[PDB]
């Protein structure tokens, strides 16, 4: 299927401390592979997956130089946007940047993206053509003019279409064992009496990778949304994911209901039934 | 591998 490489850079203002807190993380698909924390002692980009550990010192020196430089421009941007919005130096604010590239299942370039947010709201983004910007308000218009005049989109489009997609492919290969695996969901059903007239059936998917999964309930072969609920997919902490979907049913009718599971690691969609 | 060497300010 498709794959993505994405980098995430958060900086939080802290009036009364020396500098903002800056945290960067990189991911291939759903797997984290590097981090940087401005407050930590090492002052280096650090490995967070086994397959990037094989990268040599030139890689690590460069990645660390780039991420440290990025912490300084986030720091400046916090001051600039504060000024743009005429906001007090007393408050804490946030800047966020994310960028990345996707490849298809053929592993060719599918798309690139770059988005920036101030206080958790869209500020400026690169459009999908990778040539133009969308600005949320007049402040962001001042930024956009600055970035057009500097030819930022050209630099970024060269990277997104070339380097980003090349190194993604490099990582998919070097981490093939863990990154190109699919772990099929372990699947079971649960039952609890809720109300004298009713019971909950909960269909579980466990230890799966990637995170993408769909769980649906049917009654008599007919999709249900009423009295259903689906939890947000959650990390297990070991590289795999979990999810469940529940339905409450009139008690005595459990056999009308069926839970349906689709995941890339399943040759065919699973159907589960409560078996008392 | 990150875009670099670095970013323009906002």
């Amino acid at each position: 299927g498709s794959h993505s490489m994405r980098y995430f850079f958060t900086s939080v203002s802290r009036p009364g401390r020396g500098e903002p807190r800056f945290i960067a993380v990189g991911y291939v698909d759903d797997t984290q592979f590097v981090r940087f924390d401005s407050d930590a002692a090492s002052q280096r980009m650090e490995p967070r997956a086994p397959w990037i550990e094989q990268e040599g010192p030139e890689y690590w020196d460069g990645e660390t130089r780039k991420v440290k430089a990025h912490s300084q421009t986030h720091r400046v941007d916090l001051g600039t946007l504060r000024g743009y919005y005429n906001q007090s130096e007393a408050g804490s604010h946030t800047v966020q940047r994310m960028y990345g590239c996707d490849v298809g299942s053929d592993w060719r370039f599918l798309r690139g993206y770059h988005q920036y947010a101030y206080d958790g709201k869209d500020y400026i983004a690169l459009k999908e053509d990778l040539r133009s910007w969308t600005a949320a308000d007049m402040a962001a218009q001042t930024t956009k003019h600055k970035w057009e005049a500097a030819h930022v989109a050209e630099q970024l489009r060269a990277y997104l279409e070339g380097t980003c997609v090349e190194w993604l492919r490099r990582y998919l290969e070097n981490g093939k064992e863990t990154l190109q695996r699919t772990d099929a969901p372990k699947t079971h059903m649960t039952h609890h009496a809720v109300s004298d007239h009713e019971a909950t059936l909960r269909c579980w998917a466990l230890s799966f990778y990637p995170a993408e999964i769909t769980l649906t309930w049917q009654r008599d072969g007919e999709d249900q949304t009423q009295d259903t609920e689906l939890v947000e997919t959650r990390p297990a902490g070991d590289g795999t994911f979990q999810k469940w979907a529940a339905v409450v049913v009139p008690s005595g009718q459990e056999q009308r209901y069926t839970c349906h599971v689709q995941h890339e690691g399943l040759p065919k969609p699973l159907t589960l039934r409560w078996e008392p | 591998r990150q875009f670099g060497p670095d970013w323009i300010v906002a």
Epitope: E63, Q72 | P5
Partner: T-cell receptor, first 109, second 118 residues
């Protein structure tokens, strides 16, 4: 690391001059040329990103990333082109430039 | 027009064993600052550069006796202590901005010509 022949080159006014550098590190992606007059600082002439060719007046800079070979051509050379010519290059992890050792050109009036 | 990069001193002739201080004021508004040296033996080479007053790449700094600081956006110093004859060179300061660096432009000062004598 970048190799550059020191010359000196001596050419008559009006000649085409060819300067070049060779490099080893395939991570280099930005390639520049400078002129420096003796006892002064370096002045950028031409800059190229992609493996490819750029003209500006009498100057043409070229890069061949397969051969790792870059060159600068000066058409219709003038006495005032008499200078040391340096090439420089970098990647995208740092603004640090690596320079060749320079080639001295004397254009004879 | 506006000042370009100003370096000082223009010339320094000094005995080895002493401390030498090279100074640079970058063009006002510029937020990158580069220190280079140039010698007959080793050519033209970057010692260090700063962005927003912080050292980004010092891989070209000699491992002993050289120190570079940028205490504020208008002033950088490079110090050598104790100096040695092999430190003799022309030292150049340059400044720039992101949008200029993306076209490989930087602005050079006039240089400090340093001779350290036995």
């Amino acid at each position: 690391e970048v190799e550059q022949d020191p010359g000196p080159l001596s050419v008559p006014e009006g000649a085409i001059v060819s300067l070049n550098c060779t490099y080893s590190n395939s991570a280099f992606q930005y390639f520049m040329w400078y002129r420096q007059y003796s006892r002064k600082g370096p002045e950028l002439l031409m800059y190229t990103y992609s493996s490819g060719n750029k003209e500006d007046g009498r100057f043409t800079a070229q890069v061949d990333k397969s051969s790792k070979y870059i060159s600068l051509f000066i058409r219709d050379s003038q006495p005032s082109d008499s200078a040391t010519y340096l090439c420089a290059m970098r990647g995208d992890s740092s603004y640090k430039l690596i320079f060749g050792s320079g080639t001295r050109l004397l254009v004879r009036p | 027009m506006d000042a370009g990069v100003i370096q000082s001193p223009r010339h320094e002739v000094t005995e080895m064993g002493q401390q030498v201080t090279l100074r640079c004021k970058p063009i006002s508004g510029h937020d990158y600052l580069f220190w280079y040296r140039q010698t007959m033996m080793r050519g033209l080479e970057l010692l260090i550069y700063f962005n927003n007053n912080v050292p980004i790449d010092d891989s070209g700094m000699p491992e002993d006796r050289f120190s570079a600081k940028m205490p504020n956006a208008s002033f950088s110093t490079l110090k050598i202590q104790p100096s040695e004859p092999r430190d003799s060179a022309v030292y150049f300061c340059a400044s720039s901005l992101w949008e200029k660096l993306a076209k490989n432009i930087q602005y050079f000062g006039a240089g400090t010509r340093l001779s350290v004598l036995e």
